[PDB]
């Protein structure tokens, strides 16, 4: 499932089984974290996972001409808390064939709740799988009921033709 | 707002400024209603609406070979105190590049509530605009609670290349 804009640019992408082995790799990388709700690890040493993510995005996208991935990878933990609609300050791109996305990979899918809600004038989207969504859109991290929730977030800039 | 599946077949279309040219004509068509919850008017001597719908679909849908429009219109009004449920539609096309859709054009929008909400194991979409979705999906009409919600339904059948 992928979502496009009226201009033609891709805005949202929903993954099902694309991130399988890198899930275990990210789990192993995140094993070295001590009591952090949101911890950012700059990743330029073991760039193998970054190369795999770049190749996956190159093969499973449309008309992609270049891909740029930020080195740092952030990890977030969630407990039965509230959270709210963390809007983005209307990041407006400059060109017309370029877009910066946030990619979220689920390390421990919550049993109940923990769905990334996305707000758009034409309609809302609620999902529980790995996501790649535009920084322009406004997202909410809905509260969980049972179980924990761990996510890995990356910033990726792509260009189209 | 384009939506595509893993095969590349378009599934959901969200028109914002597309049908706000014939909406008055649909309103005049709806006027001939006599206390029917869901009236399936066989409309034949109004083919101008069909022609404009076909033109819009041909122009704003990508990679189109033929659009087969059906010659009936179903007006459904949803009472504030009337509730609904799932639909659980089981239907699979027998060919590759072909899909039957359901075009919902809003004639009387509600003040709040009662959006059309669509199910999928990788995301749910809630919307209150002009929607066009395939018959392979289970959908729900949410409980309206303010005002009235009267919609017009066509039956689409599109074959691509």
Numbering used by the authors:
A (entry chain C), B (entry chain D): 1 to 161
Task: Copy text from the publication.
The Ku heterodimer, a component of the NHEJ pathway of DNA repair in the nucleus, functions as DNA sensor that detects dsDNA of viruses that replicate in the cytoplasm. Vaccinia virus expresses two proteins, C4 and C16, that inactivate DNA sensing and enhance virulence. Here we determine the structure of the C16 – Ku complex using cryoEM. Ku binds dsDNA by a preformed ring but C16 sterically blocks this access route, abrogating binding to a dsDNA end and its insertion into DNA-PK, thereby averting signalling into the downstream innate immunity system.
